[PDB]
Amino acid sequence: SPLMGGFGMKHPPPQILIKNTPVPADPPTAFNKDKLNSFITQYSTGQVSVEIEWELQKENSKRWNPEIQYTSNYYKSNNVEFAVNTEGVYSEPRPIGTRYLTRNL
Amino acid sequence: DGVGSSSGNWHCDSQWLGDRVITTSTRTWALPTYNNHLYKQISNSTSGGSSNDNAYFGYSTPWGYFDFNRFHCHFSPRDWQRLINNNWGFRPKRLNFKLFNIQVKEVTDNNGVKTIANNLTSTVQVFTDSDYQLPYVLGSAHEGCLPPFPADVFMIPQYGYLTLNDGSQAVGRSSFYCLEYFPSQMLRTGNNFQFSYEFENVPFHSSYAHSQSLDRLMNPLIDQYLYYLSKTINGSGQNQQTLKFSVAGPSNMAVQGRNYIPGPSYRQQRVSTTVTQNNNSEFAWPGASSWALNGRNSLMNPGPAMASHKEGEDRFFPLSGSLIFGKQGTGRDNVDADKVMITNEEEIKTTNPVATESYGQVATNHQSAQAQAQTGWVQNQGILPGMVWQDRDVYLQGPIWAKIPHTDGNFHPSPLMGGFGMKHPPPQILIKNTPVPADPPTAFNKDKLNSFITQYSTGQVSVEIEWELQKENSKRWNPEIQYTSNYYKSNNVEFAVNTEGVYSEPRPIGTRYLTRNL
Amino acid sequence: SQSLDRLMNPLIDQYLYYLSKTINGSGQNQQTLKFSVAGPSNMAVQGRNYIPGPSYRQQRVSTTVTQNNNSEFAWPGASSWALNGRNSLMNPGPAMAS
């Protein structure tokens, strides 16, 4: 199990590598054997989509009293947590774990 | 297809099957306009040449050509290492070639600043000389091949050819070829070009070194049933002449009868890399071995496949007997010995004579009571029955094939620079940007147009070659010699890029590391 | 329409080198190796894969009689081969340029 947290796999999702194909500038009219070092300045943009299906393990606890749950605080604040600021900057105000429900040992 | 759709993918990989290896390489190329769309007569007069030996006549064409006649264009260093360490031989079988992702650009200069834009309607013309109707220039070790490093972008070399010459002038038998007199496919940005070629049957290249010498093939424990003349006089004075004979055995192997003899020779001058062992005079051209054709002297270079040096004599080389490669960044003219890589053919010393020695000695008179027996050094020896020899080894950066000249006769047409000789080698692939005239005058003028839009083209080129392998079945007990990298620490990894991204090949790599009996 | 020594591309250098100098140009102790690219400017030193065919040298005779030597040189000056002690003229011999 990865020490930083997560799922350890011998064959994880493969690395996806992307590069802009070089586009040479105008070459000299006389042959030169050296590799070209004059290229048209280029960059690329586009959209990327990733879809992941997750399997869930439902809880079947017989605990009587209510569990601890992650919840936002109703108390008034200048900004909504996990939202944008007045300058459009998105922020994550706190780390959120996964361990709120309980089960016996 | 269309402007916005790629006409091909990047294929660059090596697939190793049992008896076959398939190499695929893709490169990005750039093609400018050559000679401003013109054909030009060229000669030593146009280039300022003066010597008779270097006089020529020919034409320079506006066409470029694709060349992949070097092994590193297809084999990575690791693939080459696998091939040479695991196989006794190999040969090309078939070829697949592709041109795709054509991009034609137009260049406009206003004032000291150039603007580059796409010209979607312009075309590039490509055709293959499948009938071998044009002079073949791929048989010479010319620059301009696909780079060994896949990431390098290379410039397409300009196509030129030579014909018969008398000094700087031509003769009636000289031929002029127009490449527009050939059918060629015209490709816009959406089109692609491809063809397949089948290599004609060639022998497997000898990627092995003999573990036996031609003069040591006998049983070292058993005498021969043949005799030799051991004495002629009467030992321990006058009138002492008496014939003698002895059995040729292990104690005297030099005089044993043998069925086969080493291959031909043409002696080279010997040069030391220790400069103070050489003569204090200018002996390059003068001291060199040469051959003459129609009054022109051409250097014997590299010449017959001969052992570069005697055992232990590694400091010496034949003056023009070996392929010389230049290290990365080496200059063009008058570079030092440490800037070049001198190949050697010491592996063939078991069957081929030493380049800097006489073939042997031959009797030159009839001995008698008045005349002592005389012998003469055989400085060159032609083919004789019973001769055996090994051809020159091929290298990672060396040539692959060559076209056998169309002549009435030839003997062992293996290219002297190394590789596979073929009557019908892979055809020349010629490429040119179609001229795009500028705005013509509004009044008719019969002269050919000389104002064209400045253009160049770029795209990807892929070549796939299937190689047949000859596996080794040796019964040798001790481990073989293998090509290996050195573990010792260094500033850079061999056959890798530097801190400036420059790829370099630090040494020539042969193919002869495994061994087999003679 | 082409000569064996002129089969290369007259526009492109070879990727092979040659020893251009041996001394130290412009004295004693002047020995230093040198190498240069074989290209269109020096075609004679370029590497080549094939070489001209065999030879057996003939004597040269002019049809301008006053350019020939003032002696009898037909049989004596001729190239020959020997078989069982008999000499037979090398005639016409190997195919060679006249």
* Pairing status of strand B208-210 against strand B114-118: unpaired
Placement of tokens 């994550």 in the chain: A92
For B142, residues 6+ apart whose C-beta sits below 8 A from its C-beta are: B67, B157, C8, C9, C12, C13, C14, C15
Which tokens go with B261?
């003899």
Which tokens go with C26?
């412009």
Judged by CB atoms closer than 8 Å, whether chains meet at C48 and B298 is answered as yes
Q: Which of A36, A37, A39 to mutate to test the interface with B (most CBs of B within 10 A)?
A: A36
- Assess C12–A contact: CB distance below 8 Å, yes or no: yes
CA-to-CA distance for B46 and C44, rounded, in angstroms?
Answer: 18
- DSSP characters for B33-45? -SGGG--EEEETT
Which tokens go with B313?
């004599």
Element (H, E) at B10: none
Q: How far is C56 from chain A (nearest CA, A)?
A: 43
Contact B289, B269 (CB under 8 A): yes
Q: Is the peptide bond before C40 cis (omega within 30 degrees of 0)?
A: no
Judged by CB atoms closer than 8 Å, whether chains meet at A35 and B154 is answered as yes
Instruction: Return the closest-CA partner of residue B159 out of B187, B130, B127.
Output: B127
Which tokens go with B347?
């592996």
DSSP B439: P
For B255, residues 6+ apart whose C-beta sits below 8 A from its C-beta are: B228, B248
Contact B405, B293 (CB under 8 A): no
CA-to-CA distance for A54 and B105, rounded, in angstroms?
Answer: 49
Placement of tokens 């190999």 in the chain: B90
Q: How far is A43 from chain B (nearest CA, A)?
A: 16
Distance, C-alpha B267 to centroid of its chain: 21
Which tokens go with B257?
């009868």
CA-to-CA distance for B218 and B253, rounded, in angstroms?
Answer: 8
Instruction: Return the closest-CA partner of residue B324 out of B417, B206, B391.
Output: B417
Which tokens go with B187?
């490709």
Instruction: Return the closest-CA partner of residue B413 out of B397, B427, B428, B424.
Output: B424
- Assess B13–A contact: CB distance below 8 Å, yes or no: no
- Assess C5–B contact: CB distance below 8 Å, yes or no: yes
For B32, residues 6+ apart whose C-beta sits below 8 A from its C-beta are: A26, A27, A28, A29, B155, B433, B456
CA-to-CA distance for B360 and B351, rounded, in angstroms?
Answer: 14
- Assess B30–A contact: CB distance below 8 Å, yes or no: yes
Contact B457, B103 (CB under 8 A): yes
Number of Cβ within 10 Å of residue A40's Cβ equals 13
CA-to-CA distance for B24 and B150, rounded, in angstroms?
Answer: 11
Helical spans, DSSP H, in chain A: none
Which tokens go with A95?
């780390």
Q: String of b and e for B215-231 (b: at least 16 CB within 10 Å)?
A: eeebeeeeeeeeeeeee
Placement of tokens 């990894």 in the chain: B493
Nearest to C19 among B140, B279, B319 (CB): B319
Residue C53's identity, in one-letter code, is G
CA distances to A66, A89, A93, B118 from A98, in Å = 17, 26, 16, 54
Instruction: Return the closest-CA partner of residue B62 out of B174, B193, B165, B157.
Output: B157
Placement of tokens 């080493």 in the chain: B262
Judged by CB atoms closer than 8 Å, whether chains meet at C37 and B326 is answered as yes
Nearest to B116 among A30, A35, A40 (CB): A40
Nearest to B114 among A24, A26, A32 (CB): A26
Torsion of Cα atoms, A75 then A76 then A82 then A88, to 10°: 180
CA-to-CA distance for A43 and A39, rounded, in angstroms?
Answer: 12
* Resolution for the entry shown, Å: 2.7
Query: Number of C-alpha atoms within 13 angstroms, CB side, residue B484?
Result: 7
For B77, residues 6+ apart whose C-beta sits below 8 A from its C-beta are: B396, B495, B505, B509
- If DSSP codes are grouped into helix, strand and coil, which group holds residue B70? strand
- From first CA to last CA, the distance across chain C in angstroms is 18
Q: How far is B253 from chain C (nearest CA, A)?
A: 33
The region, left, alpha or beta by phi > 0 then psi within -120 to 50, assigned to residue B427 is beta
CA-to-CA distance for B226 and B248, rounded, in angstroms?
Answer: 6
Chain B residue with minimal CA distance to C11? B160
CA-to-CA distance for C98 and C81, rounded, in angstroms?
Answer: 20
Instruction: Return the closest-CA partner of residue B417 out of B135, B157, B92, B138.
Output: B138
CA-to-CA distance for B272 and B236, rounded, in angstroms?
Answer: 45
Residue B11's identity, in one-letter code, is H
CA-to-CA distance for B450 and B457, rounded, in angstroms?
Answer: 20
CA-to-CA distance for B256 and B246, rounded, in angstroms?
Answer: 11
Contact B237, B288 (CB under 8 A): no
Which tokens go with A39?
């290229």
Number of Cβ within 10 Å of residue B433's Cβ equals 24
Contact B212, B518 (CB under 8 A): yes
Give the method of determination.
cryo-EM
Q: How far is C50 from chain A (nearest CA, A)?
A: 26
* Pairing status of strand B455-471 against strand B514-516: unpaired
For B378, residues 6+ apart whose C-beta sits below 8 A from its C-beta are: B265, B358, B359, B360, B361, B362
CA-to-CA distance for B272 and B71, rounded, in angstroms?
Answer: 30
Placement of tokens 């010699």 in the chain: B481
Number of Cβ within 10 Å of residue C21's Cβ equals 14
Q: Is the peptide bond before B302 cis (omega within 30 degrees of 0)?
A: yes
CA-to-CA distance for C38 and B332, rounded, in angstroms?
Answer: 9
For B75, residues 6+ apart whose C-beta sits below 8 A from its C-beta are: B14, B23, B83, B396
Which tokens go with A104?
């016996």
Instruction: Return the closest-CA partner of residue B104 out of B495, B455, B398, B353.
Output: B455
Chain B residues within 8 A of A23 when measuring between CB atoms: 103, 458
- DSSP characters for B441-498? PSS---SPP--B--EEEEEEEEEEEEEEEEE------SPPP------S--SS-TTSB-
CA distances to B36, B108, B121, B362 from B452, in Å = 8, 11, 15, 69
- Assess B46–A contact: CB distance below 8 Å, yes or no: no
CA-to-CA distance for A41 and A22, rounded, in angstroms?
Answer: 9
Burial of C36 (C-beta count, 10 Å sphere; 0-12/13-18/19+): buried
CA-to-CA distance for B131 and B428, rounded, in angstroms?
Answer: 10
CA-to-CA distance for C22 and C8, rounded, in angstroms?
Answer: 27
- Assess B86–A contact: CB distance below 8 Å, yes or no: no
- If DSSP codes are grouped into helix, strand and coil, which group holds residue A56? coil
CA-to-CA distance for B214 and B261, rounded, in angstroms?
Answer: 7
Which tokens go with B129?
């000389």
For B515, residues 6+ apart whose C-beta sits below 8 A from its C-beta are: B208, B209, B210, B211, B474, B476, B480, B481
Element (H, E) at A22: none
Judged by CB atoms closer than 8 Å, whether chains meet at C20 and B60 is answered as no
Which tokens go with B315?
């400091």
CA-to-CA distance for B208 and B347, rounded, in angstroms?
Answer: 8
Residue positions forming the annotated binding site of B for Ca(2+): 344, 347
- Assess B452–A contact: CB distance below 8 Å, yes or no: no
CA distances to B214, B250, B253, C35 from B218, in Å = 9, 9, 8, 44
CA-to-CA distance for B134 and C41, rounded, in angstroms?
Answer: 23
Contact B455, B436 (CB under 8 A): yes
Which tokens go with B421?
């000789």
Element (H, E) at B287: helix B284-287
Phi, psi of A69 (to 5 degrees): -130, 145
Instruction: Return the closest-CA partner of residue B339 out of C35, C19, A9, A97.
Output: C35
Chain B residues within 8 A of C82 when measuring between CB atoms: none
What length does chain C have? 98
Contact C52, B291 (CB under 8 A): yes
Contact B462, B100 (CB under 8 A): yes
A30-34: long-range pairs with CB below 8 Å, 24+:
A30/B158, A31/B143, A31/B144, A31/B155, A31/B156, A31/B157, A31/B158, A31/C11, A31/C12, A32/B155, A33/B143, A33/B144, A33/B154, A33/B155, A33/C13
Residue positions forming the annotated binding site of B for beta-D-galactose: 252, 285
CA-to-CA distance for B16 and B13, rounded, in angstroms?
Answer: 10
Instruction: Return the closest-CA partner of residue B24 out of B57, B60, B66, B73.
Output: B73
Contact B327, B286 (CB under 8 A): no
Chain B residues within 8 A of C5 when measuring between CB atoms: 293, 296, 298
Distance, C-alpha B451 to centroid of its chain: 41
Cross-strand pairs, B402: B421
Judged by CB atoms closer than 8 Å, whether chains meet at B324 and C5 is answered as no
- Assess A93–B contact: CB distance below 8 Å, yes or no: no
- Assess C56–B contact: CB distance below 8 Å, yes or no: no
Q: Which of A29, A32, A33 to mutate to test the interface with C (most CBs of C within 10 A)?
A: A33
The answer to whether the Cα torsion of B320, B325, B330, B331 is positive or negative is: positive
Placement of tokens 């002019």 in the chain: C62
Chain C residue with minimal CA distance to A31? C12
Instruction: Return the closest-CA partner of residue B98 out of B433, B461, B429.
Output: B461
Torsion of Cα atoms, B137 then B138 then B140 then B142, to 10°: 100
Interior angle at CA B400, CA B398 and CA B401, nearest 5:
135
Element (H, E) at A17: none
CA-to-CA distance for B452 and B438, rounded, in angstroms?
Answer: 5
